[PDB]
Design a protein around this ligand. Structure first.
Ligand SMILES: CCCCCCCCCCCCCCCCCC(=O)OC[C@H](COP(=O)([O-])OCC(O)COP(=O)([O-])OC[C@@H](COC(=O)CCCCCCCCCCCCCCCCC)OC(=O)CCCCCCCCCCCCCCCCC)OC(=O)CCCCCCCCCCCCCCCCC
Ligand SMILES: Cc1cc2nc3c(=O)[nH]c(=O)nc-3n(C[C@H](O)[C@H](O)[C@H](O)COP(=O)(O)O)c2cc1C
Ligand code: SF4
Lengths: 56, 430
């Protein structure tokens, strides 16, 4: 990402394709390493009623 | 007759219910007792059992089983073992006072019924298992039994017949579960009051391993008057298959809570407005009624308007006729708290033998306390319904059913009240 305009032009012409749009080094668009805590949902059969095991 | 009720005083089978008329033997003979009892005993067991069958008298314990058939379970010849009649004078159900009233006000009817039922079954002794808290009632019963022995009505010549009979009184020590049939048998035998499984039935293995028949005090007390006055008369009272008279206790929010003898199939509204003086605030102020003692569920005002007082009528109304103990709750009460107090009673009086009744009624007590506070969720209502359905029918004795049924009645009728309490609690704690 930290490349000069002349070097970017040379890279794009030599590759034949635009490289700054899809460069393979990750800089800032990735997720933050520290995430907010999750709250995972409970699935079915957590119903506390009409939930006998012989029926499922 | 289509309508029932307004029983005649000359047809009241329990004269001296109110403590007048000299409860001792002289007053009992004046009111009519021990009359033609020798003729009854010489008439014999088959005639007495046929009299019971034609009368159609049912258990008055709350069980509802046909008395004539139940007593004719033991018409077999001798085995080698004696046979026993056992009387249930425990009366531990909330709302019930009738057994106490008849034991302290007309005990010679109970003694004569012990003799007649013991002859009908073929037996040598009747053990009256009285409740331990009824010390004065037990002492009055012992006074009556001593008077009967002095008069020669019991012991080595039963009223001049060649029949030998003994009447014993054994006191409990404070257990509602000892009002159960087999638990009472165990309590007499000297163990804990834990009911035993069936089979063997008490007619095969009862107290001391002998063939016994356990019967309610009201049942054996109406027994000799049924034998004396026919039985077509007793069947003439009440509707078909729910016949005779019945001691209704009426308690709770009524103007005059009282015990009154009334004909079967009487309307609930007629019974309350005629004998209890009406609901406090009026029939419009009436909210709910428990028609049986505590094992039966609720019925609201809407179905209390037209319901009768039969076993079959209350079964149709999704209730039962237990001890005929009408507990009345008006609109100015906490119905959830009343049901939770009943579940507290069943938790305290569970004998602890079965895992279903033991653990489930403790669980019901905790869930109902949280219902009263309001910190539950509406899914827990159906959870408690399924807990009740797991308890009911899966236990040794019927205390589990009698604890499950009030919960089922509360969920069935007053479910918006529970939901309203839960949403009020949630909105006031957020
Ligand atoms: C060389 C190694 C020693 C210096 C290392 C250093 O200090 O680097 C810091 C620093 C680079 O660190 P950076 O900031 O991460 O890189 C900036 C860009 O990301 C770099 O990305 P970029 O490729 O866009 O920049 C390269 C830039 C500069 O490149 C040069 O100047 C290289 C020589 C070109 C002739 O090229 C141009 O300006 C166009 C050159 C066209 C040539 C055809 O500066 C340099 O390296 C400057 C160039 C030094 C060239 C020295 C040539 C002689 C070497 C010794 C010979 C004996
Ligand atoms: C927990 C429990 C408590 C009971 N308490 C009594 C009681 O106090 N008095 C009573 O007569 N029957 C009581 N019963 C019902 C007896 O099973 C019944 O009365 C007994 O079989 C006598 O039969 P009867 O009604 O035909 O006379 C109780 C039953 C249960 C399950
Ligand atoms: S249901 Fe309860 S009271 Fe009845 S035998 Fe079982 S544990 Fe005892």
């Amino acid at each position: 990402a930290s490349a000069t305009r002349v070097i970017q032009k040379l890279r794009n012409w030599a590759s034949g394709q635009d490289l700054q749009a899809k460069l393979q080094l990750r800089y800032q668009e990735i997720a933050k390493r520290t995430q907010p805590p999750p709250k995972l949902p409970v699935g079915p059969s957590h119903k506390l009623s009409n939930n006998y095991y012989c029926t499922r | 007759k289509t309508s029932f009720g307004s029983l005649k005083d000359e047809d009241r089978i329990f004269t001296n219910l109110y403590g007048r008329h000299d409860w001792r033997l002289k007053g009992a003979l004046r009111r009519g007792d021990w009359y033609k009892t020798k003729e009854i005993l010489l008439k014999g067991p088959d005639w007495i059992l046929g009299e019971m069958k034609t009368s159609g008298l049912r258990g008055r314990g709350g069980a509802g089983f046909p008395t004539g058939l139940k007593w004719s379970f033991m018409n077999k010849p001798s085995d080698g073992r004696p046979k026993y009649l056992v009387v249930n004078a425990d009366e531990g159900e909330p709302g019930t006072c009738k057994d106490r009233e008849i034991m302290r006000h007309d005990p010679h009817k109970l003694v004569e019924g012990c003799l007649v039922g013991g002859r009908a079954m073929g037996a040598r002794a009747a053990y009256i298992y009285i409740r331990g808290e009824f010390y004065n009632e037990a002492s009055n019963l012992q006074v009556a039994i001593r008077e009967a022995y002095e008069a020669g009505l019991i012991g080595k010549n039963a009223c001049g017949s060649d029949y030998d009979f003994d009447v014993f009184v054994v006191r409990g020590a404070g257990a509602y579960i000892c009002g159960e049939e087999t638990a009472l048998i165990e309590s007499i035998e000297g163990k804990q009051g834990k009911p035993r499984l069936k089979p063997p039935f008490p007619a095969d293995v009862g107290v001391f391993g002998c063939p016994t028949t356990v019967a309610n005090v009201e049942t054996v007390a109406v027994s000799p008057t049924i034998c004396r006055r026919g039985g077509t008369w007793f069947a003439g009272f009440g509707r078909e298959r729910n016949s005779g008279t019945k001691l209704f206790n009426i308690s709770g929010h009524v103007n005059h809570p009282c015990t009154v003898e009334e004909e079967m199939s009487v309307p609930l509204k007629e019974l309350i407005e005629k004998h209890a003086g009406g609901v406090t605030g009026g029939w419009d102020n009436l909210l709910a009624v428990i028609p049986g003692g505590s094992s039966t569920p609720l019925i609201p005002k809407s179905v209390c308007e037209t319901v009768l007082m039969d076993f079959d009528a209350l079964v149709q109304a999704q209730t039962g006729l237990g001890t005929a103990a009408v507990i009345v709750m008006d609109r100015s009460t906490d119905i959830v708290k009343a049901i939770a107090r009943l579940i507290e009673f069943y938790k305290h009086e569970s004998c602890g033998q079965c895992t279903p009744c033991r653990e489930g009624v403790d669980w019901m007590n905790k869930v109902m306390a949280r219902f009263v506070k309001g910190d539950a969720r509406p899914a827990e209502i159906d959870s408690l319904w399924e807990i009740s359905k797991q308890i009911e029918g899966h236990t040794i004795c019927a205390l589990g059913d009698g604890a499950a049924w009030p919960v089922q009645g509360l969920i069935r009728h007053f479910r918006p009240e529970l939901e309203d309490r839960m949403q009020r609690f949630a909105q006031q704690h957020r």
